[PDB]
Amino acid sequence: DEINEPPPNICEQCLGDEANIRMTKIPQGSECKICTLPFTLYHFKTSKRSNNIIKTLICVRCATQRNICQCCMLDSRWHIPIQLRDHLISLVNEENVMTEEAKNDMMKRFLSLKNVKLGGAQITSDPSEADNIVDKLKNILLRAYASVDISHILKKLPLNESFLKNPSTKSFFLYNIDASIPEWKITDTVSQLLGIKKWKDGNSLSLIVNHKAKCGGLRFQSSELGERFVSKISETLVTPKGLKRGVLLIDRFRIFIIPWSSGFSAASFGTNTAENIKLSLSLNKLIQLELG
């Protein structure tokens, strides 16, 4: 009689805005994604005319031990993933606390019947205990390779050119890109600075960033967009006995620009990975030369 007596665990976000919702109870529905035991399952639709039926995926015993919604698998108090909720509590306390998972099919079956609890749920279930840690969150917010030769590649790189502001080509050269900064954030700011939203469906611009050579290659379409890109680049460095470069300004990181006019084709940055690591060290000297 232990099957049908404990009540369900649905958060207010899954359940919706509707006044009174009809649900369907099935006493031996699916089995639990966590414990792999049969349990009573619940159907509901948020509105009466939804396209999608919401289904309880885990049982109530496995949800109580993690203090989570049976559908979201998110926290019942904070609505955050378990992969995050342990890491935030591991910052407030100097101890490290986690939710361990059983790999073996019978040991995960053994694990669900014990009525203790585990992970951060022993904090997040109590209202008084969980408030002290959210209080301490505020105080933290108050606290605020040489042997391989790369020469044939380095001649193709247009090391010595300017923003001459001529039409030239669609093609440009980027470098000083560091091990960070995914390619979408580059192509977003270039689209944000040029002004066009939804760059990808128009297919106006093309990017290649190698991320091991630390350099990047840019292509446009419809060349009148290309000079408008140069028309928006304000920051410059006039190198002392050299040719000027325009600078992209992502947060805290600087990307310097040369018009290509002959560059393309992958091999341009390096064939293997070690050949890119050697080119990383080649440009690291040249960027130090460029600033000082």
Partner RNA sequence: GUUCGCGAAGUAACCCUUCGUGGACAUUUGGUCAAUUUGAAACAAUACAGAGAUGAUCAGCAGUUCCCCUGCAUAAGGAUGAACCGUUUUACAAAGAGAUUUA
By CB under 8 A, is residue 78 in contact with other proteins?
yes
Instruction: Provide the minimum distance between the beta carbon of 151 and other proteins in the complex, in angstroms, as a whole number.
Output: 16
Q: How many residues bind RNA (CB under 7 A)?
A: 15
Residue 141 interacts with which of RNA, Zn ion, other proteins, none, CB < 5 to 8 Å by class: other proteins
Q: Among 276, 288, 264, 149, which residue's Cα sits nearest to residue 213?
A: 276
- Return the number of the residue (223 or 273) whose C-beta is nearest other proteins: 273
By CB under 7 A, is residue 134 in contact with RNA?
no
> Three-state SS for 97?
coil
Binding mask 191-230 for other proteins (x = CB under 8 A): -------x-xxx---x-xx-xx------------------
By CB under 8 A, is residue 241 in contact with other proteins?
no
- Return the number of the residue (10 or 257) whose C-beta is nearest RNA: 10
By CB under 8 A, is residue 118 in contact with other proteins?
no
Instruction: Provide the minimum distance between the beta carbon of 5 and RNA in the complex, in angstroms, as a whole number.
Output: 20
Residue 53 interacts with which of other proteins, Zn ion, RNA, none, CB < 5 to 8 Å by class: RNA
d(CA 142, CA 154): 49
By CB under 7 A, is residue 22 in contact with RNA?
no
By CB under 7 A, is residue 55 in contact with RNA?
yes
d(CA 132, CA 128): 7
Contact region for RNA (CB under 7 A) — 44-52, 85-93, 138-146, 180-188? Answer: 44-52
Torsion angle, alpha carbons of 241, 292, 145, 149, to 10: 0
Q: How far is CA 206 from CA 154, 173, 218, 220, in A?
A: 22, 12, 6, 6
**Polymer length in residues for the chain:** 292
Residue 59 interacts with which of Zn ion, other proteins, RNA, none, CB < 5 to 8 Å by class: Zn ion
d(CA 200, CA 99): 40
d(CA 56, CA 25): 10
Contact present, 56 and 30 (Cβ < 8 Å) = no
d(CA 17, CA 287): 57
Q: What residues line the site for RNA (CB under 7 A)?
A: 24, 26, 29-30, 41, 43, 45, 48-53, 55, 106
